[PDB]
């Protein structure tokens, strides 16, 4: 299974990926998460991505395209994978076609930018796993601590209210176009396309996916 999660910042993608990953045994490929910890090491394959990411801007296609091609290669991606955050641009999308990588589903996460900003404020994450929470909507059994590792949670540098704004705008301008892209790709039998309401509680959304995935 090869799936694409399309949607804006704070839409639920990270969260929903957990469920899916274990639900279908496919590796969760998250360009943002991967980029977060690539700079968290220094590695140029990262580093010069901290500034762009913190400013709310997008990383170059080349970079994420290369990053994903490598990731997909691994032996745990031979049975499929979950693309969360990629592709985020037509060039990244086309890059996949030239690569001949057909995708089973492209899930559209529908969420009003209005929720976004109230949603990313209370977002506390656990860097390493990608696992994420909300100090109100989806809290961890223990405050400031990861449920699985019990390791302390953090907050993203880029979750700054204003950067969140930029990020959203960036989305609607660069990524949003993929909604139309993959729709066409759908009206051409190159992938099954499906929208989801990301404003339901995590569990409700988790139901919708199950419903759409099996
Ligand atoms: N291909 C590419 N090209 C160029 N640049 C790229 C790139 N890929 C990545 N990047 C760079 O990477 C950087 C990081 O962005 P990135 O991390 O890659 O994606 P994002 O734009 O930041 O979207 P978010 O991670 O903020 O939200 P999410 O939907 O992914 O996860 P979740 O919703 O659970 O987290 C949101 C919050 O919502 C809460 N939540 C989730 N579901 C629900 C629900 N159903 N109800 C209530 N609350 C919920 C959660 O608790 C959580 O706290 C970007 O700046 C970008 O430039
Ligand atoms: C550090 C940084 O983000 N620099 C680029 C930049 C500067 C000012 C802005 C003012 C208003 C904006 C609204 C939407 C997106 C966006 C993206 C980059 C901006 C910027 C933005
Ligand atoms: C919706 C969106 O992302 N808009 C792009 C954008 C808007 C306003 C700006 C104001 C000042 C700026 C200075 C440097 C870079 C930059 C990049 C995108 C901007 C923007 C920018
Ligand atoms: Mg995410």
Method: X-ray
- Tell me 175's DSSP state: I
134 Cβ closer than 6 Å to some ligand 1 atom: yes
Token representation of residue 123: 């977002």
Give the domain ranges of the chain. 1-214
Distance between CA atoms of 42 and 112, rounded to whole angstroms? 35
78 is catalytic: no
What's 1-214's CATH class? alpha beta
Which one from 88, 119, 131, 206 is the annotated catalytic residue?
88
Torsion angles phi and psi, residue 204, rounded to 5? -60, -45
Distance between CA atoms of 186 and 169, rounded to whole angstroms? 26
Maximum C-alpha span of the chain: 48
Token representation of residue 193: 């396309």
Residue from 5, 6, 10 to probe ligand 1 pocket by mutation (most atoms less than 8 Å from CB): 10
Task: Take atom 50 of ligand 1 and give the residue whose Cα is closest.
Answer: 133
Distance between CA atoms of 110 and 11, rounded to whole angstroms? 7
170 Cβ closer than 6 Å to some ligand 3 atom: yes
Token representation of residue 136: 């109100």
Token representation of residue 202: 């995590």
Provide the residues around ligand 4 (an ion) whose CB is within 5 A: 13-14
Resolution in angstroms, to 1 decimal, for this deposition? 2.8
Burial class from Cβ neighbours inside 10 Å (0-12, 13-18, 19+) for residue 213 reads: middle
211 is catalytic: no
Distance between CA atoms of 147 and 19, rounded to whole angstroms? 15
Report CA dihedral (172, 173, 176, 180) to the nearest 10 degrees. 140
CB-based contacts of 41, cutoff 8 Å, min separation 6: none
């Amino acid at each position: 299974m090869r799936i694409i999660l399309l949607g804006a910042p704070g839409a639920g993608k990270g969260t929903q990926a957990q469920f899916i990953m274990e639900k279908y045994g496919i590796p969760q490929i998250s360009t943002g998460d991967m980029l977060r910890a690539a700079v968290k090491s220094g590695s140029e394959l990262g580093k010069q991505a901290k500034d762009i990411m913190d400013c709310g801007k997008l990383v170059t296609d080349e970079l994420v395209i290369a990053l994903v091609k490598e990731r997909i290669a691994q032996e745990d991606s031979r049975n499929g994978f979950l693309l969360d955050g990629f592709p985020r641009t037509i060039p990244q999308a086309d890059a996949m076609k030239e690569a001949g990588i057909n995708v089973d589903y492209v899930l559209e996460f529908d969420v009003p930018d209005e929720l976004i900003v109230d949603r990313i404020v209370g977002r506390r994450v656990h860097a390493p796993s990608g696992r994420v929470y909300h100090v109100k909507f989806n809290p961890p059994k223990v405050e400031g601590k990861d449920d699985v590792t019990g390791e302390e949670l953090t907050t993203r540098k880029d979750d700054q209210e204003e950067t969140v704004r930029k990020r959203l705008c960036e989305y609607h301008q660069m990524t949003a176009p993929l909604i139309g892209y993959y729709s066409k790709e759908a009206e051409a039998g190159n992938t099954k396309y499906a929208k989801v309401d990301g404003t339901k509680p995590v569990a409700e959304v988790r139901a919708d996916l199950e419903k759409i995935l099996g």
